[PDB]
Write a protein that binds this ligand. Structure first.
Ligand code: SFG
Ligand code: ZN
Ligand code: ZN
Ligand code: ZN
Lengths: 104, 218, 94, 78, 109, 95, 109, 79, 97
DNA sequence: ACATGCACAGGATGTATATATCTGACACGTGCCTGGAGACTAGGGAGTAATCCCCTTGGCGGTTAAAACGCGGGGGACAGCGCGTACGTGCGTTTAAGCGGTGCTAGAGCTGTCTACGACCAATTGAGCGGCCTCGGCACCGGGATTCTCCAGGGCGGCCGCGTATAGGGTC
DNA sequence: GACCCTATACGCGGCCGCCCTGGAGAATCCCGGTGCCGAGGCCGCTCAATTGGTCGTAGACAGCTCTAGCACCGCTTAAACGCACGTACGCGCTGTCCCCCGCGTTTTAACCGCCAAGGGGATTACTCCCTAGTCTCCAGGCACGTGTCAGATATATACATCCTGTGCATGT
């Protein structure tokens, strides 16, 4: 005389992660929100010249470039992690990737 | 005598203001298996849909009809029958041996919301209903195999089970399938751990009979 | 309300020549414009440097050919050289 | 604090498209720094171009030129 | 005169030989531009465009689409070794990436 | 017969004697300095050249050279190079 | 007429404004070269040369040599941050490397 | 003519030492010979292209310098 | 019977070769290698001495930079030894093949 | 005589597909007008020939540094295990992005005018380049002085075994 | 109730890990000669920079239009955020064993120096044809407009398997 729902086993850790990997490697959308990225862009630009204006295509181009940069960087840092016999990427992996690339 | 009558349905039936999320055939995942493979999208192969609890689609899967990963829509339930249990009601026993990992069945019922679920539980308390078939598929959606369901609703809880519930995504929506966790020879009654049943009530005793039985449902 | 030159019509002509029943999106056409301008600038710049290295005032087909060999990788270079030399052979005899 | 607008979910999505399964919790802040560097450089050069043309508005071509100047040619904006 | 005849036609090309000639002249690459240089360059540009467009059309057909979109250009470029090498340091807007998961991240038995 | 090959050797040596009066320089180091001056000349000249083409100009002026300095040089190098070149231009036109 | 006055002397430079002007004119950078462009560029080249040579002379002094060799230019360039950004992709013949050993390779105490 | 074997193991060890490398696996020598051969092939290909364009039968130092520069490995000290 | 411990002569050599500015490959072997690589591009080529010297300088600089990146890769994997997979990771991240 | 086992004509809705309607996305069609094309000329860049005369190639011989080879052994790579916590999965709330619509104005983008800057040319002349010579900075050698690494034996902190002191328990 | 049997931690060295120097080579520096060859300083000359003047057009400057960039507001709702939970992954520790380093001996081939020889790069002299410049003229390509034709797409009507309920055959 109790009732109460049953609960299926949650997905094993790493299954929704792989689902997301496939999903976001299938799509071409922009993965950052647009207003936050635009606010960050204007804030960064305030240091170089005040009262600047931006074309919408300027901010969209910036977002495309930055997102592509971060995706490629994450590919290289995942290679670093896997080299170190891991599957978790850590800040040291980003630092090794950027040092070998030439940025650091 | 016989179990109380229920509309033996085959696919999930929505009810109330619940709503499914069925995607178009273009946006369902496609694996890399090939129709010439040893067992395309087979159980033991490296199917990228099977690994991720995705169900292949014959009109999307590159293996075409050689895809052994359509176990939900084709309903390859191994044959089974219903037997009254000791002090739990009616369980089910299959017709053959089952090797560990064989898709045993699919849980299916009526799709209800949270407030409708608590309404049904209240109505059950009003008439001291003791058999509950709820199973939360996600927030705002619960399966209720009480009025409508299949043979799977006749599997009992056991603290040391031989089957389990796993969520797959078929045609872009979640479905729950009972899988075999150990090599079950026939004659053995099938039972999976409900894995929770206590909402706010007195924790009905668990007469499962397992060595590590928790006594109650928890 | 002013003219804006583009490679769109020529890209579309080449498209109908190889995939007669396939279209192309406006965004993809823009990407093809950028691609043609990029490759044009690469080849023209490399040929311009080639003239200056040898102290010549003229960008000729010979230097365009050598600029193609430096910039294109392998089979692309071979087929581009063959195609261009066929175009120049055909042009000079007409 | 607009760099905090590059939220954790956004960075996780960018990691997914890069094929990253597990993500250490120290990544996020680190990644923000990386982003804020890259952006700066590009925007710096973009504004430089914008100032040389005596415009108050940063044009998509300024961004494209900055990116190409940095060896990150971008197709699709001019 | 004698019925102007559009040098691209004389070369058997689709790309504009005359416009390429003018861009070479007005672009400060050398103080003289040969006669066959624009013909050669227009032929090479047309060839590379045809190569990319063929691969992209094949890719767009693999998805059962009849329009080429940036995704298909990206797929064609990354899936072809030499086109990948030519356009390695290039980013295609709205392109995405190749689907690729490392073999160690896949679930094990 | 023997043609004249130009180089920045005498100017590099003149600049060296300003900043280190009692210091010489090997022929190989002078060759490296020649390559360095030619490389930097080509970078600035090309950047200003295409910077004029972007704006649909035909004249390479001190504004083009200045902007090509800011694009190519980092930080303090850019600041000091800009100030030095501005000084040389503003003192060139008063004579 | 006036005797002569090289434009470097007018600008107060050691680098040749006239030769830089000719190189700008004969390099196909634009069809016109302003009066102040060679002056500005000669000043900037002179500044960069002076910066590198200052650091290289310091490096030569630190090695008890009174004559700059490629090793000292390399040391000056790699030890300075700005010159290292500028010349990050440049190889210097007979320059060698900075003396760097990673801390993990040193003998454990 | 196995001329790539003339880039001997001790020479590779010296190049590794100047790179800061303390201990070296014995499989590094063939890998490094392959890497070196690939790099050399690219540079010599471009240098011979420059040479043939100038109608010369002699590869000059400037051809190598131009090839390196166009591959992004600018080399000071040879012109 | 005196003998240094395994890793001190390696550090000695590291210091000796990071102090020197000289070519570490022999001359004639590298020259023959360059000629045999160039045979497959055009026959009967000549080579200015400065050409082969510039090639050697560039190749040595390339390999030294590559070994630095390889050593960083090995240290990342908590090793001290460099192995072929480290060279491969360095070259993959750089952009090479 | 009768209700058990179980069915067959009608309903009834999922099931499969024809069908009227949108919403763009391009698809031809004008309408211009600007920029290629034809035609012709002038002159300079490039091609060819001849000639010199560096500098690359090839040979020879000796010296000796360096590579090749062998071998012991030490330490690092690498496999295995255990644990504990950090990260992934999911839920319930909250927030802020995105969308749409409105409204205003900075400033991009263009035109018109005119001027003052840069190309160009001729004459002039001094700066910079090739050639040549010398003397000091550096490379090399050699012997002595530190300096650094390595390992063999002593003190210096253990816990550790063993005989031993202290007190509980059974018995007269 | 005291006396003797008996157990159990107490301390008393009892060897031990394990630093700590001390000294022996080995390597590296350091300093004085020694000589040699290249930096650097000068000379002569030539050719490129400077002076001057002319002329044309690039661009600066003013002015105008109207695009599109920004500011704001309200609603929807998806996404972000914070927390709970539980496992699987990172990381530390251990052992083992193999492979690479350090060093000695042998072998080989790089390197150095010297000498020819001839190939081919560099230079010069002509010359001739190919490109810029120009002027005229027309059509190719771009801007804008509207048709057409899809996919998509919600509407709607017939078909296929299931559901029904009282009646057909029957064992009581
Ligand atoms: N191990 C068990 N012991 C006792 N009762 C059980 C057990 N498992 C399930 N039940 C009862 O069965 C209900 C669960 C339902 N799925 C019914 C399953 C049951 N076999 C039936 O179909 O009737 C619960 O309300 C319990 O009262
Ligand atoms: Zn499959
Ligand atoms: Zn399948
Ligand atoms: Zn139980």
């Amino acid at each position: 005389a109790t009732g109460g729902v049953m609960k299926p086993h949650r997905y094993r850790p790493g299954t929704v992660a792989l689902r997301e990997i496939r999903r976001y490697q299938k799509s071409t959308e922009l993965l950052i929100r647009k207003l936050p990225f635009q606010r960050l862009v204007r804030e960064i630009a305030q240091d170089f010249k005040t009262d600047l204006r931006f074309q919408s295509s300027a901010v969209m181009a910036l977002q495309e470039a930055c997102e592509a940069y971060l995706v490629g960087l994450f590919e290289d840092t995942n290679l670093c992690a896997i080299h170190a016999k891991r599957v978790t990427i850590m800040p040291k992996d980003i630092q090794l990737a950027r040092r070998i690339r030439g940025e650091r | 005598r016989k179990p109380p009558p229920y509309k033996h349905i085959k696919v999930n039936k929505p009810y109330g203001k619940v709503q499914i999320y069925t995607a178009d055939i273009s946006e369902i995942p496609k694996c890399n298996c090939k129709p010439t493979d040893e067992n395309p999208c087979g159980f033991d192969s490296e199917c990228l849909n099977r690994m991720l609890m995705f169900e292949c689609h014959p009109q999307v899967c590159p293996a075409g009809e050689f895809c052994q990963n359509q176990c939900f829509t084709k309903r390859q339930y191994p044959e089974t029958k219903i037997i009254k249990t000791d002090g739990k009601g009616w369980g089910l026993v299959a017709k053959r041996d089952i090797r560990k990992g064989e898709f045993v069945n699919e849980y299916v019922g009526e799709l209800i919301d949270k407030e409708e679920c608590m309404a049904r539980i209240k109505h059950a308390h009003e008439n001291d209903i003791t058999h509950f078939y709820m199973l939360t598929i996600d927030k705002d959606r619960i399966i209720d195999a009480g009025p409508k369901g299949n043979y799977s609703r006749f599997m009992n809880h056991s603290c040391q089970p031989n089957c389990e519930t796993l969520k797959w995504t078929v045609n872009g929506d979640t479905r729950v399938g009972l899988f075999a966790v150990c090599d079950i020879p026939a004659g053995t009654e099938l039972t999976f751990n409900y894995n929770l049943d206590c909402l706010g009530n007195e924790k009905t005793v668990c007469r499962c009979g397992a060595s590590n039985c928790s006594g109650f449902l928890g | 309300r002013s003219r804006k030159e583009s490679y769109s019509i020529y890209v579309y002509k080449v498209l109908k020549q190889v995939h007669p029943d396939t279209g192309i999106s406006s965004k993809a056409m823009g990407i093809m414009n950028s691609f043609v301008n990029d490759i044009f600038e690469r080849i023209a710049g490399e040929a311009s440097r080639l003239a200056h290295y040898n102290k010549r005032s003229t960008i000729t087909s010979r230097e365009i050919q050598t600029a193609v060999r430096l910039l294109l990788p392998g089979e692309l270079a071979k087929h581009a050289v063959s195609e261009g030399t066929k175009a120049v052979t055909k042009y000079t005899s007409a | 604090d607009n760099i905090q607008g590059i939220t954790k979910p956004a960075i996780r999505r960018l990691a997914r498209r890069g094929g990253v399964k597990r993500i250490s919790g120290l990544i996020y802040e680190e990644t923000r720094g990386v982003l804020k560097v890259f952006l700066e450089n590009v925007i710096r050069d973009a504004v430089t171009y914008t100032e040389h043309a005596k415009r108050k508005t940063v044009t998509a071509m300024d961004v494209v030129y900055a990116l190409k100047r940095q060896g990150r040619t971008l197709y699709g904006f001019g | 005169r004698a019925k102007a005849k559009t040098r691209s036609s004389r070369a058997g090309l689709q790309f504009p030989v005359g416009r390429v000639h003018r861009l070479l002249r007005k672009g400060n690459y050398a103080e003289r531009v040969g006669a066959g240089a624009p013909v050669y360059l227009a032929a090479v540009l047309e060839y590379l465009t045809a190569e990319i467009l063929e691969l992209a059309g094949n890719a767009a057909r693999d998805n059962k689409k009849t329009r080429i979109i940036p995704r298909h250009l990206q797929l064609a470029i990354r899936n072809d070794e030499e086109l990948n090498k030519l356009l390695g340091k290039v980013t295609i807007a709205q392109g995405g990436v190749l689907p690729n998961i490392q073999a160690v991240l896949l679930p094990k038995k």
